[PDB]
Amino acid sequence: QCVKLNDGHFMPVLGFGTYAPPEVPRSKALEVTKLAIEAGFRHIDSAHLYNNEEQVGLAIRSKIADGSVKREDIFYTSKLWSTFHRPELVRPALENSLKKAQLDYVDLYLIHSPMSLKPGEELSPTDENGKVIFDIVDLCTTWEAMEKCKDAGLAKSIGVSNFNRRQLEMILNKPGLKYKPVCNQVECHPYFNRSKLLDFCKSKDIVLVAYSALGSQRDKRWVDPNSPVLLEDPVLCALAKKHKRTPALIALRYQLQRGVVVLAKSYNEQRIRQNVQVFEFQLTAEDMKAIDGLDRNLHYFNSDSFASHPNYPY
Numbered sequence: 001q002c003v004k005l006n007d008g009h010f011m012p013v014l015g016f017g018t019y020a021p022p023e024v025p026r027s028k029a030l031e032v033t034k035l036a037i038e039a040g041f042r043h044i045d046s047a048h049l050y051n052n053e054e055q056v057g058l059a060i061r062s063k064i065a066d067g068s069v070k071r072e073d074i075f076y077t078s079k080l081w082s083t084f085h086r087p088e089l090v091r092p093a094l095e096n097s098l099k100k101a102q103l104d105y106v107d108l109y110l111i112h113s114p115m116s117l118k119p120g121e122e123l124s125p126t127d128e129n130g131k132v133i134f135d136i137v138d139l140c141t142t143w144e145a146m147e148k149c150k151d152a153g154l155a156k157s158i159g160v161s162n163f164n165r166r167q168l169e170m171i172l173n174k175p176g177l178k179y180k181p182v183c184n185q186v187e188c189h190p191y192f193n194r195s196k197l198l199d200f201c202k203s204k205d206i207v208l209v210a211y212s213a214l215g216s217q218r219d220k221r222w223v224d225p226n227s228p229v230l231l232e233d234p235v236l237c238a239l240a241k242k243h244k245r246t247p248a249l250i251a252l253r254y255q256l257q258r259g260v261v262v263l264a265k266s267y268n269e270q271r272i273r274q275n276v277q278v279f280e281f282q283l284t285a286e287d288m289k290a291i292d293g294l295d296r297n298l299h300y301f302n303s304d305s306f307a308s309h310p311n312y313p314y
């Protein structure tokens, strides 16, 4: 069901991923988020970047209004985008996300990325020649503002995302730190299991939350289309046939059994309903080591632009 975070709040171990590319109409996010909740999902992952907070927020309020759930049954996550790292922009950004979602609080607010961008109204500020424009921000000052947000009850819990071990220790060793990150949300799948990072997070009681756990949406803007398709993996497919389940269910169950909290995006009613079946079966110890063996040091997200960022975690 849930795992106890280091601030005493509780996070459900299966989460619905709400990101869709801009080519998908905004109305779908409202439709599918209601369906996710209808199928059993209680953890819901959004962000300012996704341009979908209004719709995801309305789906939550929809399912509270019709009596299916109460607000305290729902774990709602947003993320501070990289153009708002400067400490004075953090709380208005969160307050802006609350207003879009028409909620009083988020269950979880994250620094979306350590790679600061130029402040402004543009998600991806690019210079006179189309190159992204970086900013330089001491992320400890950003974290201090995150902590103020938790102390104001605007975020029940705070954490980070796309941080490496070095960027985490910077927070953990900050003088006067008040709140440790409750999680580190990072790319994690059988082709990149992050076992070393996972062990470091366990050592600090930091939850690792896996994104692109099914191999990502393979958007060619960000992912090489000729990379291996995770769900087409023969070991995963052979384990699906063995357990009368499906490659995606295998890949999801793998993370739960390693103590990872796992996200799964789908905008397809039947696949949404299928993913909640992850709680219905068990992987053996022999299957787990076989999935461990698929690790290929492959992060699907690749960008020559962000690779030169003095904050690039890889």
Ligand SMILES: NC(=O)c1ccc[n+]([C@@H]2O[C@H](COP(=O)([O-])OP(=O)(O)OC[C@H]3O[C@@H](n4cnc5c(N)ncnc54)[C@H](OP(=O)(O)O)[C@@H]3O)[C@@H](O)[C@H]2O)c1
Pocket: 016, 017, 018, 019, 020, 045, 046, 112, 161, 162, 185, 186, 210, 211, 212, 213, 214, 215, 216, 217, 231, 246, 248, 249, 263, 264, 265, 266, 267, 268, 271, 272, 274, 275
């Ligand atoms: N913090 C970060 O930097 C970050 C980065 C990436 C993602 N995330 C979060 O993590 C979420 C999930 O990651 P993701 O968007 O990369 O996708 P994902 O969870 O890895 O899913 C990849 C694809 O799998 C398909 N799928 C879903 N269930 C399936 C099933 N049972 N059988 C077969 N295929 C299935 C989906 O297609 P259909 O929609 O057609 O079903 C989806 O496009 C995101 O939505 C977002 O909330 C965070």
Ligand SMILES: O=C1C[C@@H](c2ccc(O)cc2)Oc2cc(O)ccc21
Pocket: 019, 047, 049, 123, 124, 219, 222
């Ligand atoms: O699929 C993407 C694209 C990518 C991105 C978009 C715009 C940009 O300027 C930089 C990165 O970040 C993401 C973050 C997320 O949480 C989920 C999905 C993605």
